[PDB]
Design a protein around this nucleic acid. Structure first.
Ligand SMILES: Nc1ncnc2c1ncn2[C@@H]1O[C@H](COP(=O)(O)OP(=O)(O)OP(=O)(O)O)[C@@H](O)[C@H]1O
Ligand SMILES: Nc1ncnc2c1ncn2[C@@H]1O[C@H](COP(=O)(O)OP(=O)(O)OP(=O)(O)O)[C@@H](O)[C@H]1O
Ligand SMILES: [Mg+2]
Ligand SMILES: [Mg+2]
Ligand SMILES: [Mn+2]
Ligand SMILES: [Mn+2]
Ligand SMILES: [Zn+2]
Ligand SMILES: [Zn+2]
Lengths: 356, 348
DNA sequence: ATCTGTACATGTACAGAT
DNA sequence: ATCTGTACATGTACAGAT
DNA sequence: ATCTGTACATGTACAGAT
DNA sequence: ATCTGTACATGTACAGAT
């Protein structure tokens, strides 16, 4: 009941969706068409909408959109980067429009992202229809972010991605454990879909920095978000409603509110809560464990689970099991205890941050 | 007890499956290669395996196989046949054939017969044409007899015809997303090859949805995991197997049941799977009740002379025009008997 | 004259609006 | 409840290319 | 255009555990 | 008696090579 009214606050307004989507789709279409023109290195690039807005778990406002510009790259050798599971060097063996980005048969991520970015930058200069600029490059981001002033502020992440149609890399063999939940036939089909490589683009200063790519499964996550039940009819018009997406929204919101206030929580992002809930959905596969009447206990067990990930410093990648998003090397124990305290406090005092 | 033991009988044997399959595959591959690799009117024909053996509901022996050779054909105009639902005249390589089903089936058939004469490593003949069949049936004699039905089909890639719009009522069982996806697939037209001497008989084709029934048979649960290695087993296919056995055993004995076929049983259980969508209503521990409630549904179809095409609801497979009222009363009394006496026919 | 990448045309699940 | 805008999958038309 | 290679679903068969 | 786990077999989807 309290949680029901929070979800009401979080609910997107169709009027805002129309105005935001109209602008966003103009700018994305124009950008996609420029990449196809002339001798462009990214001719053939294809669009793929991903992220919360296209999963229907975008909360508060339609003000951040994620778009993959995926490029199919045949004949690819992968070199795993120091057994991390998630990061790869990409190599060709043909000796090609990616020519300028090669580097001794190693594909440079930062060279390829720079050229990509320069093209976007130039195309944006030509838009005098809407108030759109390109954000200053943020480190770690595989994106070229647009800031649209639609009056209202709207971020768009154009994510550059390599597309391989081969079988997924062995580090993902034990990942995507949906057998007891969405089943083996779904798992086999999902894994026949391509996999993607986005540039890691770190600033750290470490070996291979500009040639390290990171795996991406936003397309699979989008499918799972929109086909999330053990029963084929979950949330359909002739089926029963579950509260799975609603729990994701409330936990996304707890993390946004907290991250808005405290800069201690910079290391944390929404993908942390998105990953934790895929694990919850696997742990509790049955649609009856996500009954809308038990929204409270469902939201509570998700916090209990998230709190155990923080304290034990373990949140495995859903697709790459050996990859721990809460490792010491990525997030300080300080940062984890701090967030643990803040969650425990919201939990046990009636979620006062839900009222700001 | 007893039903479990009957299903042990009806189970195919791994040995028999590989001997039948490798011989059937030799013949179908050669036939299929001829339809294109020799320049013929069916140059773009593609193979599509259908029926009980490929749905894993074939019983007793692997001795009947069903194959569609489907041919893509852009820009066909469909015309319904007297609001029958399932029968249509087709209009616009094929030039030699209003696209006449008889005329195309005959050449298709001529081509098969020619190739079968060039097969000197398999004992295989072409069965005499049955009016009423859209198939070219091959009789293969391994030490065992094996029927293969080669079914000619047109493949259309538009919307399904209006008569199906109320069909496939899987919304509360397999769901809306599955229904929309299935209905994005092509639909198929096969020949209506009856001898009845009625109006347009020779040019009429019949809708086929074997490709859709294959998916349903192999994606039949409300839960995605039904019958998977990390799911629960249901007894849905075993009920189909048993109801199929009962009709096969009766037809073998009683000439009066000639007008019945397994597709009646298959159609009835689709309706029951829609009426009872929950996987737990098909728990293996309730095989007897499930089989019995399927028997009672089938007897209620007979009593009321009503068994609508699962995909084409206004087509009543149990109409008077297709099956005589006497035939249905005859089958009602036979099933009611077997049911009330512990299925004697299951012991022979 | 025919071929074909691009975009229109069609249908509907999702979920916000009324 | 029903009505309705967006996203998205797939079929098809045709200007411009050949 | 056609074909092989790969992965894993669907099955059966049987022994050891229940 | 059934359940579980391994071995054995065929079907089918699609990537990549030719
Ligand atoms: N750290 C990450 N590791 C892997 N994939 C990530 C990561 N961050 C984001 N992604 C992928 O990119 C998508 C877009 O990221 P983004 O930060 O916009 O979050 P979101 O899930 O769309 O939600 P929101 O924008 O509302 O916070 C994610 O849904 C996920 O698929
Ligand atoms: N009367 C019919 N109307 C429509 N489709 C039919 C009809 N009879 C058969 N079919 C289609 O052709 C397929 C093959 O028919 P067939 O008689 O071999 O049955 P089956 O399902 O293969 O089972 P079995 O051969 O074991 O009796 C069917 O499964 C169905 O898709
Ligand atoms: Mg986002
Ligand atoms: Mg058959
Ligand atoms: Mn983003
Ligand atoms: Mn047949
Ligand atoms: Zn749901
Ligand atoms: Zn099942």
């Amino acid at each position: 009941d309290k949680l029901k009214k929070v979800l009401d606050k979080l609910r997107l307004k169709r009027k805002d969706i129309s105005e935001a989507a109209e602008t966003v789709n103009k700018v994305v279409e124009r950008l996609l068409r420029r990449m196809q023109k002339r001798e462009s290195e990214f001719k053939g690039v294809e669009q793929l909408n991903t992220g919360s807005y296209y999963e229907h778990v975008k909360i508060s406002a339609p003000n951040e959109f994620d778009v993959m510009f995926k490029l199919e790259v045949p004949r690819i050798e992968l070199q795993e980067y120091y057994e991390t599971g998630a990061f790869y060097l990409v190599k060709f063996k043909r000796i090609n429009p990616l020519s300028h980005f090669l580097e001794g048969e190693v594909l440079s991520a930062t060279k390829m992202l720079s050229k990509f970015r320069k093209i976007i930058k130039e195309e944006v200069k030509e838009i005098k229809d809407i108030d759109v600029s390109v954000e200053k490059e943020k480190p770690g981001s595989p994106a070229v972010t647009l800031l649209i002033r639609n009056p209202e502020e709207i971020s768009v992440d154009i994510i550059l991605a390599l597309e391989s149609k081969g079988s997924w890399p062995i580090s993902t063999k034990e990942g995507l454990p949906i057998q007891g939940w969405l089943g083996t036939k779904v798992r086999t089909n999902l894994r026949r879909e391509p996999f993607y490589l986005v540039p890691k683009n770190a600033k750290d200063g470490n070996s291979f920095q500009g040639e390290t790519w990171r795996l991406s499964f936003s397309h699979t996550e989008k499918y799972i978000l929109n086909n999330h039940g053990i029963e084929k009819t979950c949330c359909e018009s002739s089926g029963a409603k579950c509260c799975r997406k609603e729990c994701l929204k409330l936990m996304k919101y707890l993390l946004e509110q907290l991250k808005k206030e405290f800069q201690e929580l910079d290391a944390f992002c929404s993908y942390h809560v998105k990953t934790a809930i895929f694990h919850m959905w696997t742990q509790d596969p049955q649609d009856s464990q996500w009954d809308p009447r038990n929204l409270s206990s469902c939201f509570d067990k998700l916090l209990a689970f998230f709190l155990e990930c923080l304290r034990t410093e373990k949140l495995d990648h859903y697709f790459i099991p050996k990859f721990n998003l809460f490792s010491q090397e990525l997030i300080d124990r300080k940062s984890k205890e701090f967030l643990s305290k803040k969650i425990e406090y919201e939990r046990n005092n009636g979620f006062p941050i839900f009222d700001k």
